[PDB]
Design a binder for this molecule. Structure first.
Ligand SMILES: [Mg+2]
Lengths: 151, 127, 98, 101, 114, 79, 206
RNA sequence: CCGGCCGGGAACUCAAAGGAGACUGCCAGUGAUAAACUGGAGGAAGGUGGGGAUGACGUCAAGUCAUCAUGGCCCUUACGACCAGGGCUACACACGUGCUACAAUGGCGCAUACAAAGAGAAGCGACCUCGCGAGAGCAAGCGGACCUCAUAAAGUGCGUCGUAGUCCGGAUUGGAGUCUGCAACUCGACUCCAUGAAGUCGGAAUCGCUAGUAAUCGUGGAUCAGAAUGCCACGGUGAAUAC
RNA sequence: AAGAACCUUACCUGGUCUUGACAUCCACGGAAGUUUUCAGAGAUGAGAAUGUGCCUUCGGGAACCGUGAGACAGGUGCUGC
């Protein structure tokens, strides 16, 4: 805000095996307050990917995440006349939140049968670093690294 | 021997009778597996119960009303926490440090005239 | 026995009327259940403070109806007679039923 | 405030109180499932128009008692919101105050 | 599966395929099903001809594609030649149930061309 | 779309109706009762229905029985 | 017009309701109509008596009316002939026996209604608006009070455009709820039009 | 007859009244030893605890002479009044605010659980019968912490749809049916038969929201003889970001 | 506008009236009230059977109903500049 220097809210750990990042992920997926079905699809696709990759659930999610985790971000700060872009780092909190949002978007789109299926497919292609969230990250790195003369 | 917990959350209110013995849940004459044991928010009533063993420490005869599923769930959680009085500050010094004793009212705000849900306006438009 | 239900608008009046009437009833008609509070009912009204456009401009008024059961348990002779002809403390509506 | 319409409503009300609630038999009784479904009920619903458009409880707009305002009327206080609020803020309605909670 | 109308469903459940007939809906189709002893979950690639015959002779009871088309045609022509409000609306191209025409009712009126 | 229990008419209207029935075809009968139905005996009348300002003479028809008079008495004129 | 009614906002905290009685929803409307009728008729009759207000109750289906005024002599007439005429002509319309009782206030200039009525009498007596305002404020504050504020709207001076003017003296917190404030507004009809006068007197602080 | 159904208690929630407490209360630091800011103990709540009502002097010569009263004007056998019907629902067409949606977190059908606050006597309206359903009839209780609205729905178990302008979606339209009401053509609501459109996320531009809020679901009330996707009110799951 | 089938309705046509639908007066006549027929879109007009006291000033009274002028009623008609 302008004056308030407040922090962020305090979410609860998920009922399923302890976690907070994927709890916030399910809270993002939750629309119209449909937490039950959001969590259902979350767990379904989670265990699907876990069994497809042979690993454990939260670690497979971390694998699919680190690949989509970006490096920098472009923002506009006009200085005396012409308006321009500027590439700059991003906090880890918003970094991982934006990675999860890209995951959710690539999952929502490209619908084969069901949302569990879409989310597991995106998880897989991100774990092997060939999905659409990773391509979003690549596009972000394209936007950056080019106009880096502004600083 | 048999202690009482009140419990309430989001316009809901409960009644819990805690007793040393088995560990079954009589939740409105149902089991926790039935009442909301297939739906989300399942271990909500169990969240205040893992810091101290519960499987074979004490059972609870529970009833609830008011609010929705999660509302009555928070009600039962507050009821557990109030019933935790024969297990007094010796344990509250940490239970509170991690919450579970804060009412966390955040009561729903009445709908204000001119609005749609007490904060939602009727889609303003300059022209 | 005698279900005695009184009702008013103002708590500071119904309270004193109930106190004095329960006194005059149990001082000779003892074995009462007391002034059971009978929770309040609120009749609310929303009106348009303006006579014209500015429909959005409105106001909210209300009226509170408080009641007090007494529930006398015995149809005493010091009660059936010394309760009637004693409907003072205007602004209150009373109904006794045997 | 259209004293003519006021007398119109007064007529409607009085003539209705006279005819209906007392002569419902024609339209509310003879029009029943029974042998009377023959020419009996036909003649009943025909004599129906023995009364004019008036005499009915449907033409009762329930206008205001002070100003005849049909809109903004409340069946409780018998008056429109305008005079309702007037008398309220003046303190004439027993037990009425500002509702805030 | 040449039932009245056109009725060329392949691998479609009973009522969902039968409603295709202009003259039958889900309800009348379920009635036909319970009459001819037909289920409402098995498809055309699995139904037998000894039961397709019952389909035919049971749907023959209510109006059909062509019969219903011509019946509606003669009814609306009756309205038009009657020249009541209904026929006047039918001829002017406006709805007949009396909804909004000032703004709505564009479906019956015509595309929002100009 | 209502009043299942038979039709509804006006005394004056049915009186003129049966008068014209027993007298034969007659000039248009002015009827302001758009809220009335038609009977199997009025086929052949040339009654004039009210629209709000003017009378529309209509030749009754056996198919024009269950309908009303406002049906064939246009009230709103457009262009 | 963006301010709330002081008396209305203070009813639920400090000031008492004008009509104090009970009634079920079935007869609340007719009860209020009878109250309005008796009120307007009594005002029509005794507007000369300078009545500040009237409280209306109904003990056991019988009407009772306290008249908070300042000229009980004029209200009653010698031996109470006026009291009797009023009781009769009011019970006729009320359908029940009426106990009408007067009650004097020996500080009439502290009543919003009485002061508005006096300013209106002077407005029809052709007295200057400034002088009337100042004289009423002085009357009140010199008789005793913790603040006053008067306002007038209309065509003061009989001019062509409508100009409203006010004048205050002392402390007068309206947003304060414990402030027992006397408030009322009168009307005055002259050859020029309508004139609305209003007053607020900070009588008490609790 | 396991229905607190009942004898039996005032244990408990709840209950209306009368009070306590939550006021920077105190401590550590910072701050010009001041104001004050930040963190912390206990505590449910910490600094205006949450929300609400409360609208400064006055501006826009803002809107209402149609709620009412009124300065003047004007009709005053009339610009007055009554009655049948019609109109306000009219339609080349442009715009604003809401519901439905435009689907697979799901349409879909069967079995399952959980709201608070209210209203209700020329009204709410048990049981029972029929009625696909409007709802019809007989006929208890209730002008009320009893009798009725009133079964709460999302949530969950089984599975069709397993991706198609499709079983998403319901408008247009005819015959036939119930109901409010003197009457349903203009011009009502409701339930069934037949129907399924555009619409596949929406262009520039633009609105609301920092919490139980939005999002979404359901329920009640006023208007009413009858007539909401609106208004008001209550509750349901329950976020996000804030550099 | 917290709710247009009539009404609501302030608009349109047609049929009506006039100190008038609405409050009051004098004088005159009838007591009201109740049932009923005819034409009309009805308003209204043409009617037919029933109906009498609360006080005796008791040449009548208190309401109710109708007739004549007048004062007037009546307007959702104008300017919210
Ligand atoms: Mg000037």
């Amino acid at each position: 805000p302008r004056r308030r220097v407040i922090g962020q809210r305090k979410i609860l750990p998920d009922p399923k095996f302890g976690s907070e990042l994927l709890a916030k992920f399910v809270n993002i997926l939750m629309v119209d307050g449909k937490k039950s079905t959001a969590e259902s699809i979350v767990y379904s696709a989670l265990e699907t990917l876990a069994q497809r990759s042979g690993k454990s659930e939260l670690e497979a999610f971390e694998v699919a995440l680190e690949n989509v985790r970006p490096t920098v971000e472009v923002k506009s700060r006009r200085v005396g006349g012409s308006t321009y872009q500027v590439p700059v780092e991003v906090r880890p909190v918003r970094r991982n939140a934006l990675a999860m949002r890209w995951i959710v978007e690539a999952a929502r789109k490209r619908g084969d049968k069901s949302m569990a299926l879409r989310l597991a497919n995106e998880l897989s292609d991100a774990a092997e670093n060939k999905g659409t969230a990773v391509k979003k990250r690549e596009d972000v790195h394209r936007m950056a690294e080019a106009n880096k003369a502004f600083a | 021997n048999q202690y009482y917990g009140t419990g309430r959350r989001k316009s809901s209110a409960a009644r819990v009778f805690i007793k040393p013995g088995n560990g079954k849940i009589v939740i409105n004459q149902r089991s926790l597996e039935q009442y909301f044991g297939r739906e989300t928010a399942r271990m909500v009533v169990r969240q205040p119960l893992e810091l101290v063993d519960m499987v074979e420490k004490l059972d609870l005869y529970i009833t609830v009303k008011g609010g929705g599923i999660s509302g009555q769930a928070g009600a039962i959680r507050h009821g557990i926490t109030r019933a935790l009085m024969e297990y007094d500050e010796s344990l509250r010094s940490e239970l509170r440090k991690a919450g579970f004793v804060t009412r966390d009212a955040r009561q729903v705000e009445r709908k204000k005239v001119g609005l749609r849900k007490a904060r939602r306006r009727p889609q303003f438009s300059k022209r | 026995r005698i279900r005695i239900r009184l009702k008013a608008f103002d708590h500071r009046l119904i309270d004193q009327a109930t106190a004095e009437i329960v006194e005059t009833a149990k001082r000779t008609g003892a074995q009462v259940r007391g002034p059971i509070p009978l929770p309040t009912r609120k009749e609310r009204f929303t009106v348009l403070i303006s006579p014209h456009v500015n429909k959005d401009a409105r106001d909210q008024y209300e009226i509170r109806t408080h009641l007090r059961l007494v529930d006398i348990v015995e149809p005493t002779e010091k009660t059936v007679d010394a309760l009637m002809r004693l409907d003072l403390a205007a602004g209150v509506d009373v109904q006794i039923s045997l | 405030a259209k004293q003519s319409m006021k007398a119109r409503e007064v007529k409607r009300v009085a003539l209705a109180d006279k005819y209906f609630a007392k002569r419902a038999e024609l339209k509310a009784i003879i029009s029943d499932v029974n042998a009377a479904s023959d020419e009996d009920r036909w003649n009943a619903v025909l004599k129906l128009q023995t009364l004019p458009r008036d005499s009915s409880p449907s033409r009762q707009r329930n206008r205001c008692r002070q100003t005849g305002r049909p809109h903004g009327f409340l069946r409780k206080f018998g008056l429109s919101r305008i005079k309702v609020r007037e008398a309220a803020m003046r303190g004439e309605i027993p037990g009425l105050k500002k509702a805030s909670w | 599966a040449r039932i009245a109308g056109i009725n060329i469903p392949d691998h479609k459940h009973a009522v969902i395929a039968l409603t295709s007939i202009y003259g039958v809906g889900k309800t009348r189709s379920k009635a036909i099903l319970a009459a001819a002893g037909i289920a409402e979950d098995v498809k055309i690639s699995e139904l037998s001809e000894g039961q397709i015959d019952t389909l035919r002779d049971e749907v023959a009871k209510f109006v059909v594609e062509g019969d219903l088309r011509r019946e509606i045609s003669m009814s609306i022509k009756r309205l038009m030649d009657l020249g009541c409000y209904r026929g006047l609306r039918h001829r002017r191209g406006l709805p007949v149930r009396g909804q909004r025409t000032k703004t709505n009712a564009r479906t019956r009126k015509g595309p929002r061309k100009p | 779309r209502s009043l299942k229990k038979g039709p509804f008419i006006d005394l004056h209207l049915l009186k003129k109706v049966e008068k014209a029935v027993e007298s034969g075809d007659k000039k248009p009968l002015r009827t302001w009762s758009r809220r009335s139905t038609i009977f199997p005996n009025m086929i052949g009348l040339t009654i004039a229905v009210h629209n709000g300002r003017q009378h529309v003479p209509v030749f009754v028809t056996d198919e024009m029985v269950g309908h009303k008079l406002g049906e064939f008495a246009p009230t709103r004129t457009y262009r | 017009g963006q301010k709330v009614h002081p008396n209305g906002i203070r009813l639920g905290i400090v000031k008492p309701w004008n009509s104090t009685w009970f009634a079920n929803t079935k007869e609340f409307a007719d009860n209020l109509d009878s109250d309005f009728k008796v009120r307007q008729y009594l005002t029509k009759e005794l507007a000369k008596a300078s009545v500040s207000r009237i409280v209306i109750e109904r003990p056991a289906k019988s009407i009772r009316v306290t008249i908070h005024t300042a000229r009980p002599g004029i209200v009653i007439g010698k031996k109470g002939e006026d009291v009797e005429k009023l009781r009769k002509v009011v019970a006729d319309i009320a359908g029940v026996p009426a106990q009408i009782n007067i009650a004097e206030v020996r500080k009439p200039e502290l009543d919003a209604k009485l002061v508005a009525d006096s300013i209106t009498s002077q407005l029809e007596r052709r007295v200057m608006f400034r002088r009337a305002m100042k004289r009423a404020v002085q009357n009140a504050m010199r008789l005793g009070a913790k603040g006053i504020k008067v306002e007038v709207s209309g065509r003061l001076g009989g001019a062509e455009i409508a100009r409203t003017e006010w004048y205050r003296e002392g402390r007068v917190p309206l947003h304060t709820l414990r402030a027992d404030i006397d408030y009322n507004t009168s009307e005055a009809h002259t050859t020029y039009g309508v004139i609305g006068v209003k007053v607020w007197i900070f009588k008490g602080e609790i």
